[PDB]
mmCIF file with all atom_site columns, N, CA, C and O in Angstrom:
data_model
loop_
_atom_site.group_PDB
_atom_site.id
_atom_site.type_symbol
_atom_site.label_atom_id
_atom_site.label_alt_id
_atom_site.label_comp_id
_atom_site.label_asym_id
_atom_site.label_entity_id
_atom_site.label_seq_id
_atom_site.pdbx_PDB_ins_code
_atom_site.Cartn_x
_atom_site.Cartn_y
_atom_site.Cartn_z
_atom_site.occupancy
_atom_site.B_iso_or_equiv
_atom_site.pdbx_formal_charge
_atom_site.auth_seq_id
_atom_site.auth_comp_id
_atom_site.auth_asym_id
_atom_site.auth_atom_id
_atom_site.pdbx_PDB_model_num
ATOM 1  N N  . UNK G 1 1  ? -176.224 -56.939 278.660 1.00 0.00 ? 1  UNK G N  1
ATOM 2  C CA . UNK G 1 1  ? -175.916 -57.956 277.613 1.00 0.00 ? 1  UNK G CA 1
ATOM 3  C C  . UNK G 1 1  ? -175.681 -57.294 276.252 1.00 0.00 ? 1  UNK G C  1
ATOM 4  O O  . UNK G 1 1  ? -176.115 -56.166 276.020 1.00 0.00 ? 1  UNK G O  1
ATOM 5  N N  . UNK G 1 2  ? -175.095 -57.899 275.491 1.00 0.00 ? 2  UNK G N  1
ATOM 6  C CA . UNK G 1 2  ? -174.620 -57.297 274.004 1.00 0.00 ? 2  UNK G CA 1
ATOM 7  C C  . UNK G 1 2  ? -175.417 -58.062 272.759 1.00 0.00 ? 2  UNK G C  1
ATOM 8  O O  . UNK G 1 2  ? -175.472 -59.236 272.393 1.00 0.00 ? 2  UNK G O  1
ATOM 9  N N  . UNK G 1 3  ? -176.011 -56.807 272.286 1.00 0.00 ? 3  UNK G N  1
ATOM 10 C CA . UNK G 1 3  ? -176.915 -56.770 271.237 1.00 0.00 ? 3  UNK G CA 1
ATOM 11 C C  . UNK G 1 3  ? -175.910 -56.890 270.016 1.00 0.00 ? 3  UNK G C  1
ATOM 12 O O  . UNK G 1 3  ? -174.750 -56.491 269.918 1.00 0.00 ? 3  UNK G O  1
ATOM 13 N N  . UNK G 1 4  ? -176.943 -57.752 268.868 1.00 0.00 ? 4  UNK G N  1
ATOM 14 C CA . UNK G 1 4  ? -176.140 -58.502 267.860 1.00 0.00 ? 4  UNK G CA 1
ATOM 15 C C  . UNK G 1 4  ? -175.513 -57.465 266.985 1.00 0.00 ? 4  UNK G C  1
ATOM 16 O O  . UNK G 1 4  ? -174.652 -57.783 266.165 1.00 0.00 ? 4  UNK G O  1
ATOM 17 N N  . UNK G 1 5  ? -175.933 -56.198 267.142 1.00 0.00 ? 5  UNK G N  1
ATOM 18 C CA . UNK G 1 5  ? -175.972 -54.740 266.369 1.00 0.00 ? 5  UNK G CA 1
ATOM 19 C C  . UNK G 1 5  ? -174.601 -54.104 266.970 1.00 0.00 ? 5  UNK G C  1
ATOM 20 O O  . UNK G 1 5  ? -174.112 -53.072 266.510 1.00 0.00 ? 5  UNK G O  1
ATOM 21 N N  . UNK G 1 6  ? -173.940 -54.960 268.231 1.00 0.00 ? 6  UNK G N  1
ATOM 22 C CA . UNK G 1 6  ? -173.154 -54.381 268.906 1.00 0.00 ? 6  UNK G CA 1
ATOM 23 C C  . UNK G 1 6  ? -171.871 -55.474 268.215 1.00 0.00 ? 6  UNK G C  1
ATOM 24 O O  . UNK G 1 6  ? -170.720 -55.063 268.070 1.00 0.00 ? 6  UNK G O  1
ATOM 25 N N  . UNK G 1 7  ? -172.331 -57.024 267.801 1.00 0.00 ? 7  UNK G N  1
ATOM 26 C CA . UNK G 1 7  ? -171.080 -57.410 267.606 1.00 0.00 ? 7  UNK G CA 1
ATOM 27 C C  . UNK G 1 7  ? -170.635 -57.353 265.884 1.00 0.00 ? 7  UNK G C  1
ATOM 28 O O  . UNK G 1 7  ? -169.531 -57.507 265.362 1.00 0.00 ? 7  UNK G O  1
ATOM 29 N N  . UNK G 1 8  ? -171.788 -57.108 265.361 1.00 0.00 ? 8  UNK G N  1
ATOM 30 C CA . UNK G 1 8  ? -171.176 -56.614 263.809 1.00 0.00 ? 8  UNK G CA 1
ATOM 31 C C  . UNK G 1 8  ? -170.665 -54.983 264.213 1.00 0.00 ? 8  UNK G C  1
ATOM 32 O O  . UNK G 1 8  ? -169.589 -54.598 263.755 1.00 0.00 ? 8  UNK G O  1
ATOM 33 N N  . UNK G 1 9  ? -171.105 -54.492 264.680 1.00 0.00 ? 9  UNK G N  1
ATOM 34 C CA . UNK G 1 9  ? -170.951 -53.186 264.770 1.00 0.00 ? 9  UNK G CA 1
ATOM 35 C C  . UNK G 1 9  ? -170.949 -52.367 266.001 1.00 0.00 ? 9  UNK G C  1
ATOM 36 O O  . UNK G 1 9  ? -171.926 -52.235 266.737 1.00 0.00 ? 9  UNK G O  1
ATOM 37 N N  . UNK G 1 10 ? -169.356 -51.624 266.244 1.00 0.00 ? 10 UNK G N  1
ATOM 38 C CA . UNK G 1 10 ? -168.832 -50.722 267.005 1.00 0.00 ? 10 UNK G CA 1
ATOM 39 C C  . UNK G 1 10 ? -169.586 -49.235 267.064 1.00 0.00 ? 10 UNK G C  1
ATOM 40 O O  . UNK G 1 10 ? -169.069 -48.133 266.883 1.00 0.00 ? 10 UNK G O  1
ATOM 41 N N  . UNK G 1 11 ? -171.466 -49.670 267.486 1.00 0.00 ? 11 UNK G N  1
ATOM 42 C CA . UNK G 1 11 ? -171.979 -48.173 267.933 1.00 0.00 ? 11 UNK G CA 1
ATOM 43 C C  . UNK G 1 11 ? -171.732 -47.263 268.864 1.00 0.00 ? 11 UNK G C  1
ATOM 44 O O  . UNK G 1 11 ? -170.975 -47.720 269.721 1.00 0.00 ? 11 UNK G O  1
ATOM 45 N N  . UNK G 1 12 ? -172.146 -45.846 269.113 1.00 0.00 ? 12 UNK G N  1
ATOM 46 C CA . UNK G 1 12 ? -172.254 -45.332 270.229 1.00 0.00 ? 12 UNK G CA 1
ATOM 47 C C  . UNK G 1 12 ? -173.217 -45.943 270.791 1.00 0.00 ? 12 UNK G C  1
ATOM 48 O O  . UNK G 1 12 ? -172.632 -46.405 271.771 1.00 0.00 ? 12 UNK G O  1
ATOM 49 N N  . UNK G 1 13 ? -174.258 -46.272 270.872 1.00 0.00 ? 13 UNK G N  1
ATOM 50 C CA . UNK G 1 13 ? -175.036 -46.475 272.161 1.00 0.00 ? 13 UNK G CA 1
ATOM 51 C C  . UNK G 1 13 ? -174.662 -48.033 272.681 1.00 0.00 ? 13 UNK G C  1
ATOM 52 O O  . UNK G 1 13 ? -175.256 -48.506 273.650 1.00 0.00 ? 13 UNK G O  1
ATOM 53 N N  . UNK G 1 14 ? -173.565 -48.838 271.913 1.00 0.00 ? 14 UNK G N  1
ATOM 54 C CA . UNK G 1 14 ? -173.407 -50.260 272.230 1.00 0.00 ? 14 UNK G CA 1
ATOM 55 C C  . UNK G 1 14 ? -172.206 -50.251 273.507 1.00 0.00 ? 14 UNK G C  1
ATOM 56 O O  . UNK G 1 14 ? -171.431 -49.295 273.488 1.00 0.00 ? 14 UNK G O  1
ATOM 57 N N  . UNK G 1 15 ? -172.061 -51.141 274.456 1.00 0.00 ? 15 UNK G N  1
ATOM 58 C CA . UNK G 1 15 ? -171.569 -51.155 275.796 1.00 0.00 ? 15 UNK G CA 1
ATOM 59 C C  . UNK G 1 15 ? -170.083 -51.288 275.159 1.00 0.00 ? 15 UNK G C  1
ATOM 60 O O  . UNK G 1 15 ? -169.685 -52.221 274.463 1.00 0.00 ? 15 UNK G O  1
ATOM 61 N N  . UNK G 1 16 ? -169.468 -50.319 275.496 1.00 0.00 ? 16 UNK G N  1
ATOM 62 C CA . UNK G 1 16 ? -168.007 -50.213 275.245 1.00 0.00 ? 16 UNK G CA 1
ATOM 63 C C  . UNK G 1 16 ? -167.037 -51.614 275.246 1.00 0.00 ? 16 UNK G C  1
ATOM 64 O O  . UNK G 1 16 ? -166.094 -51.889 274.504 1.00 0.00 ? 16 UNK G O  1
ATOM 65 N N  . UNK G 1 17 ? -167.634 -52.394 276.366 1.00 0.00 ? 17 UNK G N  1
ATOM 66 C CA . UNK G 1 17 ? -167.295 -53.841 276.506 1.00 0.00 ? 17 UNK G CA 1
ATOM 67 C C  . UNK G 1 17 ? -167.751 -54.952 275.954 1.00 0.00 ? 17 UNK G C  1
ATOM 68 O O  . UNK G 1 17 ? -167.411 -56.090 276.278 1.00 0.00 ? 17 UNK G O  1
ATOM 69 N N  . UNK G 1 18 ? -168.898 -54.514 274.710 1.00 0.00 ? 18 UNK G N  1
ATOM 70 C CA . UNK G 1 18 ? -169.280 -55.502 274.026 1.00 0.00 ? 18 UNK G CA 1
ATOM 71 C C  . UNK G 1 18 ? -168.576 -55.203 272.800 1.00 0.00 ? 18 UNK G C  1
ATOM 72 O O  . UNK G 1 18 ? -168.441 -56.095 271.963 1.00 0.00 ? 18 UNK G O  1
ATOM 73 N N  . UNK G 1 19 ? -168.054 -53.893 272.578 1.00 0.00 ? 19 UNK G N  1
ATOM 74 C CA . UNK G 1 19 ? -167.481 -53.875 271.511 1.00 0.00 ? 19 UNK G CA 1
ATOM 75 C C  . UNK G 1 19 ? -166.272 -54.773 270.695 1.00 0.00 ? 19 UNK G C  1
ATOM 76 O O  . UNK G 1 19 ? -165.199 -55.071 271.219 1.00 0.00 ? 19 UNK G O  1
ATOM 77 N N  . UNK G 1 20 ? -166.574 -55.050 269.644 1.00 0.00 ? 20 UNK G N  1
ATOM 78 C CA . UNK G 1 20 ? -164.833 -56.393 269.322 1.00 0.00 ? 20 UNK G CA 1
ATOM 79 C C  . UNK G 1 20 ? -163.679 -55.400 268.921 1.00 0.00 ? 20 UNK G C  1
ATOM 80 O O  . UNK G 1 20 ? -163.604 -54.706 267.907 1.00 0.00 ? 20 UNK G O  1
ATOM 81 N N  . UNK G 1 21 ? -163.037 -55.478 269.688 1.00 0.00 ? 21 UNK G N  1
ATOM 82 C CA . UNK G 1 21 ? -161.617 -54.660 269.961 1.00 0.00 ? 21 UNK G CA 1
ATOM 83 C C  . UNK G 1 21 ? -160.594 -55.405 268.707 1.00 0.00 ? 21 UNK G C  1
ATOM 84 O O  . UNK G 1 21 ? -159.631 -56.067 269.093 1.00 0.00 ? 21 UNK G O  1
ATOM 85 N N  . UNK G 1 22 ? -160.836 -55.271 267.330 1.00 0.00 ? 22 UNK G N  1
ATOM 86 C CA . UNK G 1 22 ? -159.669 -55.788 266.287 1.00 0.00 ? 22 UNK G CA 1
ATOM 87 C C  . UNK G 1 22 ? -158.393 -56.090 266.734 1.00 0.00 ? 22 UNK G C  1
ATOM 88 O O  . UNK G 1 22 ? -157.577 -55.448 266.073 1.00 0.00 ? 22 UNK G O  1
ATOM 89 N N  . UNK G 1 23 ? -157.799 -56.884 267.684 1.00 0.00 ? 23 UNK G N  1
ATOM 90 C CA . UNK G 1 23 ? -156.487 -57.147 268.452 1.00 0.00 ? 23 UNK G CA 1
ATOM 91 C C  . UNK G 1 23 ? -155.902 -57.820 269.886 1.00 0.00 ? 23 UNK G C  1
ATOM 92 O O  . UNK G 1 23 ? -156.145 -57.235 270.941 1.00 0.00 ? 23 UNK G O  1
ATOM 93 N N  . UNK G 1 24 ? -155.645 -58.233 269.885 1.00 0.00 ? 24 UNK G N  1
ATOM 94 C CA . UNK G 1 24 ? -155.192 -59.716 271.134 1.00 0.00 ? 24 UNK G CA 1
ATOM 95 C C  . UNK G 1 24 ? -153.534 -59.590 271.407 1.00 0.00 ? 24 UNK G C  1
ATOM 96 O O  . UNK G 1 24 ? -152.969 -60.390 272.152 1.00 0.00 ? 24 UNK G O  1
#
């Protein structure tokens, strides 16, 4: 699951797939 640390912010230790990808 994706930690709130993951959707303000593109970490290394955050799941590559929780990351918000800026683009559609």
């Amino acid at each position: 699951p994706c930690p709130p640390v993951c959707v303000a912010q593109c970490v290394p230790t955050c799941p590559q797939y929780c990351c918000p990808a800026k683009r559609k």
